[PDB]
Structures are given as C-alpha cells and as structure tokens.
Amino acid sequence: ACDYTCGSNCYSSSDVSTAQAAGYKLHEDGETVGSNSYPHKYNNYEGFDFSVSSPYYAWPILSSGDVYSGGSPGADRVVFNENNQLAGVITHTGASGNNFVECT
Numbered sequence: 001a002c003d004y005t006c007g008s009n010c011y012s013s014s015d016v017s018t019a020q021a022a023g024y025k026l027h028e029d030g031e032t033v034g035s036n037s038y039p040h041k042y043n044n045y046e047g048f049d050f051s052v053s054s055p056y057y058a059w060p061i062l063s064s065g066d067v068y069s070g071g072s073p074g075a076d077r078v079v080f081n082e083n084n085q086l087a088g089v090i091t092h093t094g095a096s097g098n099n100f101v102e103c104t
C-alpha cells in the first residue's frame with residue numbers, strides 16, 4: 001500500500017525520508033539545483049493544515065525512485081520546515097493551474 005498517493009504516483013515513507021534528506025541538506029548548505037532553483041521557499045497559500053511550524057520549503061520527489069538532481073521535477077513535492085520536520089507531501093496533479101492539493 002502507498003503511504004502517500006499523489007495522483008497516480010505511489011510513495012512509501014522511505015521515499016519521502018530520502019527526498020527530504022536531500023532537500024534539507026541543500027537548504028542547510030545554502031545551495032540549489034535545477035533551473036527552478038530547488039528547494040523553493042513554500043508560502044502555503046493553499047492554507048494546508050500542517051502540524052509543524054514554518055518557514056516551509058518544497059523539494060521534488062520523483063516517482064522513479066531517484067533523488068532529484070535537475071531536469072523535469074514532475075508534479076510532486078515534499079514540504080519540510082527549517083527544523084527538518086516533514087510538513088506533508090503535495091502535488092500539482094488534480095489541482096488547477098499551478099496550485100497544489102495534498103497527496104492522500
């Protein structure tokens with residue numbers, strides 16, 4: 001079973017932890033990757049009810065299992081905070097325009 005389902009993509013907690021660790025590492029070191037410069041500060045305009053405090057950052061999580069290293073980021077993102085706490089997993093899939101909806 002999927003711990004997180006983003007549209008048609010299935011993610012286990014381990015996939016999320018791996019992606020989060022990569023994203024947080026870059027944030028701590030002060031570096032970015034990709035033309036869109038990830039990780040991105042995430043403002044949470046959607047108003048998701050995260051149980052952890054902001055600031056938030058979004059980092060791509062890939063359905064292929066690989067860690068994002070540039071190129072097409074897909075539609076899914078892991079959101080973590082300044083303290084390296086998981087806020088949630090979100091996706092553009094099933095959302096209008098460039099908005100996000102939470103993965104189930």
Ligand SMILES: Nc1nc2c(ncn2[C@@H]2O[C@H](CO)[C@@H](OP(=O)(O)O)[C@H]2O)c(=O)[nH]1
Nearest residue numbers: 036040041042043044045046058098099100
């Ligand atoms: N929808 C949305 N996008 C945000 C927010 N904060 C920052 N962004 C960033 O703005 C960009 C365009 O919507 C997104 O890039 P991304 O789609 O590559 O993740 C996203 O990371 C927010 O709260 N909501």
Ligand SMILES: [Ca+2]
Nearest residue numbers: 011012015065
């Ligand atoms: Ca997997």
